[PDB]
């Protein structure tokens, strides 16, 4: 337990099958960095003591994580990056639950540390292939939805007239009919006294099919399957299956990885798409000195399984916080991601043909952010509009239509070689001339 | 304050909320296809086959989830392997619409790197189709 010479092995050669972790580490004053890195590697069975007591275990001879590198953090005085290798034999095949238990289960309480943040994980191809992963992934999703060469467009339903299931469905219909691909259950809407789940499912299915008959395009609504229990959760997933509707939704951090993986497997087995909402992520991922960075939680989700993932907004963020967001968007979507520290990527990640996950971005209040969103995300993203569609003065359907026109004109202009960073305002104003809905949204 | 009409107002995915692309607008999209190394292809359908429908689901059990008929259209000739000049696509668009005047025509593109369809937008609506609105759709 934290001998510093057993666990800090700076000449260790990293194996291909090892799981690597990068911990941003804040030692207690006077505690040397090599002792802290070793303690995190060891996960000592005393978290209060910070000293070896019971030493010599067959859990600690060949099944031990080793701290193979400690680096200083530039501009910080008491922070280090500790790199820990874990042998693949430590981990239950296909169990995100068990990988977090093994890596983050105990070390964040260790008294020799003042603060500890888990920045990144290298998931080896040998571990990656044990997971079912996302039910469809971005490509299959585009083929099943018949939708190519632009972002997908969503909006959250917040009805003006009631939270009843019938009014909820009316609003879904009005948004979808105007041009949106998807609408979205709010993450807390599970099954309440004001709106029981099965009533919500039925009225949303009528709305989806009405807007689909009207538009001739495939339509969905993310039907929240998050429940108190696995049986209730599967009751809802089964209902969606039987309605023949395209997509359901889960809050993977509050439901849990065990339930999320069960759900992702149900969705693979029955062809449902799985939208993933990231409620409570800021409890864990916000503070720079402590917790688990979102890119790790996104990587976990890609392994557990989800076809879309809420990935934040880039509205109101600086270029440096935008570099970070684009880093994890590449970890979500791509097959092979190279080490890139300035994007916060600490490890080369090989997804080994595991399907990518579609990031879902909060678009802003208005449609003038559309050129920036298209330039930053590219086409493989859902842009969610929180009140673009509904702050529109003419109502949900023209608001949806204004968002769709703006997305399509920015897409057209991007393909024509125009610079959306410079000319995006000129693209929107030019589409306002022929689109009365977009012209009324830009009056706001 | 205007009302988005639900009547005869069918959409055909990417770019259908824009005015119909002119020949210069189609040529500029084909330039985007060619520069990326993508393979253009044309597809067409008659109006009754143009938009998504559920009629095959009569044969099914509880498996209709994300099944829909008429996503597939009919290929016009072959994917234009080695297409570098946009005037070939524009010629093929004219030839398809001449052979099939009552047909919607869409231009798709395939990326042989990622081995997947990567574009699809409409280049022609048939005049005889009443299913769609001429951008006075309010």
């Amino acid at each position: 337990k934290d001998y510093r010479l057993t666990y800090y092995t700076p000449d260790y050669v990293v194996r291909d099958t090892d799981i690597l972790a990068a911990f941003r580490m804040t030692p207690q004053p006077g505690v040397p960095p090599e002792e802290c890195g070793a303690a995190v590697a060891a996960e000592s069975s005393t978290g209060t003591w910070t000293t070896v007591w019971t030493d010599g275990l067959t859990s600690l001879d060949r099944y031990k994580g080793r701290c193979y590198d400690i680096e200083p953090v530039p501009g910080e005085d008491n922070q280090y990056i500790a790199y820990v290798a874990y042998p693949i034999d430590l981990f239950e095949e296909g169990s995100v639950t068990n990988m977090f238990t093994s890596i983050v289960g105990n070390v964040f309480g260790f008294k020799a540390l003042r603060a500890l943040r888990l920045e990144d994980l290298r998931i080896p191809p040998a571990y990656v292939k044990t997971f079912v992963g996302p039910p469809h992934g971005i490509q299959v999703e585009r083929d099943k939805l018949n939708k190519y060469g632009r972002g997908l467009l969503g909006c959250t339903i917040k009805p003006k007239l009631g939270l009843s299931a019938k009014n909820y469905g009316r609003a879904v219909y009005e948004c979808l009919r105007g041009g949106l691909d998807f609408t979205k259950d709010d993450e807390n809407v599970n099954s309440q006294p004001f709106m029981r789940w099965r009533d919500r499912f039925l009225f949303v299915a009528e709305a989806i099919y009405k807007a689909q008959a009207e538009t001739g395009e495939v339509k969905g609504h993310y039907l929240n399957a998050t429940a108190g229990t696995c049986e209730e959760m599967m009751k809802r997933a089964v209902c969606a299956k039987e309605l023949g509707v395209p997509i359901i939704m889960h809050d993977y951090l509050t439901g849990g990885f065990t339930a999320n993986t069960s759900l992702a497997i149900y969705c693979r087995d029955n062809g449902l798409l799985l939208h993933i909402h990231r409620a409570m992520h800021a409890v864990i991922d916000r503070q720079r000195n402590h917790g688990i960075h979102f890119r790790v939680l996104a990587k976990a989700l890609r392994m557990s399984g989800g076809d879309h993932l809420h990935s934040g907004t880039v509205v109101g963020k600086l270029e440096g916080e935008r570099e970070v967001t684009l880093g994890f968007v590449d970890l979500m979507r791509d097959d092979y991601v190279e080490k890139d520290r300035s994007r916060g990527i600490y490890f080369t990640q090989d997804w080994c043909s595991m399907p990518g996950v579609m990031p879902v971005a909060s678009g802003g209040i208005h449609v003038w952010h559309m050129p920036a969103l298209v330039e930053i995300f590219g086409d493989d993203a859902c842009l969610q509009f929180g009140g673009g569609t509904l702050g529109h003065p003419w109502g949900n359907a023209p608001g949806a239509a204004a968002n769709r026109v703006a997305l399509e004109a920015c897409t057209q202009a991007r393909n024509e070689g125009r610079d959306l960073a410079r000319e995006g305002g000129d693209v929107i104003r030019s589409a306002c001339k022929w689109s009365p809905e977009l012209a009324a949204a830009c009056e706001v | 304050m205007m009302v988005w009409t639900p009547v005869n107002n069918k959409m055909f995915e990417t770019f259908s909320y824009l005015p119909p692309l002119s020949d210069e607008q189609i040529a500029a999209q084909v330039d985007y296809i060619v520069a990326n190394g993508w393979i253009p292809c044309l597809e067409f359908a008659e109006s009754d086959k143009a938009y998504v429908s559920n009629e095959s689901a009569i044969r099914f059990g509880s498996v209709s989830c994300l099944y829909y008929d008429n996503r597939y259209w009919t290929m016009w000739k072959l994917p234009m392997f080695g297409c570098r000049d946009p005037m070939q696509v524009l010629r093929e668009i004219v030839a398809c619409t001449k052979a099939f005047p009552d047909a919607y025509v869409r231009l798709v593109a395939f990326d042989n790197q990622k081995q997947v369809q990567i574009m699809g937008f409409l280049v022609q609506r048939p005049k005889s189709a009443r299913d769609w609105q001429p951008a006075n759709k309010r």
Binding site: - | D23, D31, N36
Partner: peptide
């Protein structure tokens, strides 16, 4: 994605298209 460099169409492209349509 590469930058789409433009291709000036042949001078008779409008004309070529008009003859073909007929």
């Amino acid at each position: 994605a590469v930058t789409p460099s433009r291709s000036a169409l042949p001078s008779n492209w409008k004309q070529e298209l008009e003859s073909l349509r007929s």
